[model samples]
Target chain A: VVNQSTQEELANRFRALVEANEILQIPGAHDAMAALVARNTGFLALYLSGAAYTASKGLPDLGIVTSTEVAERARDLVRATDLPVLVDIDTGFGGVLNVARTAVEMVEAKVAAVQIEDQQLPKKCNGKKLVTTEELVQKIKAIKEVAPSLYIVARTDARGVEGLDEAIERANAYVKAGADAIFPEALQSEEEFRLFNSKVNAPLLANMTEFGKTPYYSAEEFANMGFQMVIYPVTSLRVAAKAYENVFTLIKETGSQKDALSNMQTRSELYETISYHDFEELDTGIAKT
Target chain B: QSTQEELANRFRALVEANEILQIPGAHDAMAALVARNTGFLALYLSGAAYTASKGLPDLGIVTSTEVAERARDLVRATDLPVLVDIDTGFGGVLNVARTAVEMVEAKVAAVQIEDQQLPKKCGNGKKLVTTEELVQKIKAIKEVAPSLYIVARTDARGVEGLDEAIERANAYVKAGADAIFPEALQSEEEFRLFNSKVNAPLLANMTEFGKTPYYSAEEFANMGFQMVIYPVTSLRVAAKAYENVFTLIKETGSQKDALSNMQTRSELYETISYHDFEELDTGIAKTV
Candidate 1:
């Protein structure tokens, strides 16, 4: 498929970096502002976390969201910035063919990369047992055959089910089936991280998240290992939550932005950052020539 | 399922499929679906038309987020290629950049960002952006959203002379706009010149009571235009028909006078494809 300005450029950037580094700390950008702020903050890569995706749509975490819904909105987020977005297409939305189509569509959107997991329905496998190892291996094979050029990050949820060793084994099988990266989720301990890195031949993903029952580690620790990309999936979301909560309170109390608008980016600043002046320049160019 | 590039290609296909692609501008999802099913090749989301349809006078109180939400609804309803009106890209280059990304993500087939000054007052007509500013905005769209169709629109027919209007269209093309929408174009000669002057695709507007003269679909096609949008045509017709029904109800205390013009209930079900719905029921029977 032909790549548009936002889609094609990002995909090319994702492949080159993953092949070169210990793994990029791709942040999970939940909204347009987060996307801009993340990029401006000098993040080379980004991830659109499934949970954050759920929150953005104002829905509770359930498989209530369709592949089309997430894919389309992710398309918007991916399009809004030039950042290489690693999107989560939970359970490939169904069977192998369904997963195949999801991969194709995401690639068409030029999402620099995509991560798929065998967490079963509602994508609630983080704390629970996941689909059988053999079942996920089959799905990973289908993804490889369909879009080999895409940076497919195959995730295993067996840490809660079959345990860390089993998770590592599942990830290795996925790599054997042609996964570029293996995301062994809920791997809390340094031993689990070392175990995953040692067992899985491909680049490793550390889901460096806090606030759960799971242990959280600093991004630098993950980088120190030969381990690649660590996703701070909830960092921007946490920041965004704090910022939004404050704004709504100010709006509700003051009925005007007297106290709060100062914290907010000025309309001119917002417009300038967004390039409204470019349009004015386009208008002027037409006048002269 | 849409990538900006694929959507852009689809927009081109919609235009090429028709002798003269008849486009009806739609404000909401319900109207957009109606237009898509009416055998029209394309649907337009007009800012001016939507502002008027919302029971408000046409001014620029509409926000970018608000417009994007409306566009998302229309896009979600059908596979119809929906083109949005991102006036002045809302704020600036960065805003335009965001507009490009947001429109693509919303599954928009194309977004036409016009060269118009915003917050337009009541009595005042539309304001056109300077040629330079509009080009840069279009360029910003290309820079930010390379795949989604960015149709550079000019209200220049009312602002600058016809020659300048055509020049603005060319400028947009150079700035990486995938298509051109020449708004308020008057006369067949101007249409022919605009069409002939550019090798890329072109869209013609059919808004009523403007300085532009109304031309037939065949006339637009003959002039080498790629698409023709009857922007506000369906909405205007729907409004007039509703008024007729309202007046009859008031005068006669019933809707009997307007009954003949109204589509039958069965026809309405047929329009939404009820029979195929049964097939859908069969497919999901065991899952439930």
Candidate 2:
């Protein structure tokens, strides 16, 4: 019943994507349906944002969700799309031991890469506190020791907390701690992006989040600025949440949603999107057997 | 983990005590939590809503495992009694038995197994299985999971007329169904007629854009129904919401204007008990 690529295979696929010269545009998929849509739209990889995932569950982006919860959702995305997923494991859900456990769980879930941040527990979007560079390095090392095949995108919140220099220093330290890639969060301008990329020796990931400190830089521009990957984290959730509000209001005003039928995904389109016929064939095949 | 027996007892108590248990269709954990926060006693995991959330039609395409998994999420998130719509128990008698076991493992409170054949549809031109066949499936479920409450849903009114539907409901109840759900009843008299004939807890489906009129919970209770489910309401609103915001994003690069319509970050935190989780992690006591 479970048919998916091995952890090593998926990790290697993600490594290949990062190693490619072109910028890997990884969009955040909060659910399986969003992952399917992203695959349909020609994305090679997917990002699972903590903010988006928590919000989808009607929870805040606080560091309250567990490794098991994140891994289960990651497993669903991987099962639906079979794409290499970069999961945002906030502070590895705890310290070094927690990071080790999170790595094993992600490996069991067959995740391609994990983006572990250096922010303190109860992580927020802004005015956040960061763990020491040494603390994060230990977490990164623990993950590599536990699951070497799992890719690591060590994210540093030092850019906002300390400065670009300390953020770059932490990125380099994380690289030395066996991180597969580096993610410098909250880089304010293009110069800071370029400067951090120039300083860090490993593959760099840029967060092009909306309504945040970062500007809306296209994937090409980020690639030119020396970043290997760019993530539009929380975009899918933002749109979906906004969509839910609009339709709910419309339905509250009108007794029926007959007028908004044109806006919804048609039955035929839904069937194709979820491979309903394939599932039907599977059922038919089982009956034959 | 909450046991199926405990949840079933809770569900039975709620059904017996309440004038009318108004169960809203919660397609996902998010919807389940929102419904729970809004003071709903129980929830309904509708087949149509679950399949539609996965972007599939409700044509018996989803598996028992998939449905049970989604039901597990709802139970985990809300810990509320959820009556899941397991479409025709996903197969025949053996399939029904296996589904019963799986629902128990998933900690589902109750399940609504309909009297439709495999590859079933929600609306018109639907076909019903033989009464004997459905009775066997109900027996099979009760034999395996006796504690798991069974709401045997009969779609015979749209197919075999009201009297035949009542006959089937009584047969299912005798076959160990704890409750009966008469689907697609045309009017108030039809509901009362079926309720008078069926000697079990009755359920009315208040689905939108269906053959059933928009009846309030009190009205349904007055007509002798103990439970009412607004199946697919959450899914409909969510689907519509997706369309509107997605279109806005496509036309405009950013969702700046739509932020006003979205659930704010603070409101979301309060709904999900964000601080409670933090306190849980820190081992801090709440002062208030």
Candidate 3:
């Protein structure tokens, strides 16, 4: 049985982190505490979505978030949580050399997992079959060879761009080339999730998020569909957006947080989550007295 | 003044003798350089301020490795004790150890680790781990980085509650942390509670519009805290103050309209201490 207590052996926990009953629901957030909280909340795993990286920079999703940008953030998140983190590297940034470099850097930075999708430029939109299937396989192969121990999450944005048939074909090829998990981007419905599950052998991931092309699904639905991993990549972010918008409105209206405190997580609750009180204990333990 | 070590020692002396030390936060090397010129007792390299100034959110997004990367440039640019916001020690026991060693190697005088969650992104699944867990993380860090001058930062004041924040600050002192940064205290009562409860030197964050009141260096001194930092003040105030100056420089070749606001080119050179540069040049100009 999986144990998640204060015990050392019990607690190196991750989201379903591969358990089968329910899909391990992982929340993607940037910063060290976000990683810690995600793991503490029982995510089987965590995801470092690239769009979130853009959002973190106060910029609209675009290409300005560079390789260095993602790498630094990935390292922070990975270090924060014990659970394996799957980083989203769009198009693997470039060809074999780039993927190879990217793979090594992510591994060195201690990311337990990495997801590289097959795409072309701008990286804003996916589902374009710009790089051929053969080249993608080559890059995946290059990636696996570099970091054999690291979890290689190979994603294909093909279904959204191409039809279901070709996307499945590509997923099968990527799995054969040694992908630990397959995140088929933009699967229209449960039928597609079933289609991929029916054909694929390894772990399957369901990206059930709001605002994306894919309709959101509960954990149970994904669990029934045989998805081992589920990513609520922007759920927390979406919630935060609503909170920020409301808080700013109140702050501008009142020039104070008096009204917004109701909506805002109290300072004490916020610290409890991050465990601020623990620092005080640590302080006394180390003090001269 | 001569070396990073000497400067750090001197600053530590000031902190020891003075009631409270105030550091204006510097976001980057350029800002750190300017803050050094502002005549503060010291300076802070705040993690949140860095992210905000660099246009990133204060999530677990910026890595400890990246912070080190950011600090190497700042330390090289200034002669002050730069207290850095290290966040969650950045890794495992090993990672924290490496962070301490590497940061010291990078010449950051001290690093403060918060008891906050690891991936502290806003609205991300929020919950506190067991107190035992945090104590171990701190112990592991202290064991590995005994001499790196680790400062324990308690966010409990804002999250778990001030009482707990105080309790943890005390625990952190027991865990071998050299100093305490009690974060998010809302009032003087909480601050006084922390001072009385925890038997160690303390740092009070003077971050604008956050939880704490705008307590000055003198105020912090009166309260018995050793260090008080305006962690985002310079970056925020400078950004607020210098909009027209930058626009004018960018639009017009010369900063004539903004000339009054400008530090003359000579003063800039003086702050850079070009006399030392010229003396070196004289000595090394083909062996004089």
Model-by-model DockQ, in order: 0.02, 0.23, 0.03
Best by lDDT: 2
Q: What is the lDDT of every predicted structure here?
A: 0.65, 0.78, 0.63
lDDT of 2 by residue, A1-289 (tens): 3136788999999999999977888878787777767777677898899888887775667666789989988987888888999999988888789889999999999999999888876543224787888898888889889999999998887877798788887888899999988988778777887788788899888786666677666567788888898886877766555444444444334333445555456555556767767766666666667
- Best prediction by TM-score: 2
For model 2 chain A, the run of ten residues with the poorest summed lDDT: A248-257
> Per-prediction TM-score, please?
0.52, 0.77, 0.52
Model 3, B23-142: lDDT tens digits are 656655545655555455566778866765443446555678778877776677675677878878776567777777777777777778877776433223344545566677678766
Q: Residue B123 of candidate 2: its Cα lDDT?
A: 23
lDDT per residue as tens, model 1, B66-165: 7887788777656667888887788877888887788878778888877787654322256776778878887787777777777887778777877887
- Candidates' chain B TM-scores in the order shown: 0.87, 0.94, 0.86
lDDT of 3 by residue, A54-87 (tens): 5433333445456767887786665445456778
| Candidate 3 off by > 4 Å | A1-16, A122-127, A276-289, B1-288
The DockQ leader among the candidates is 2
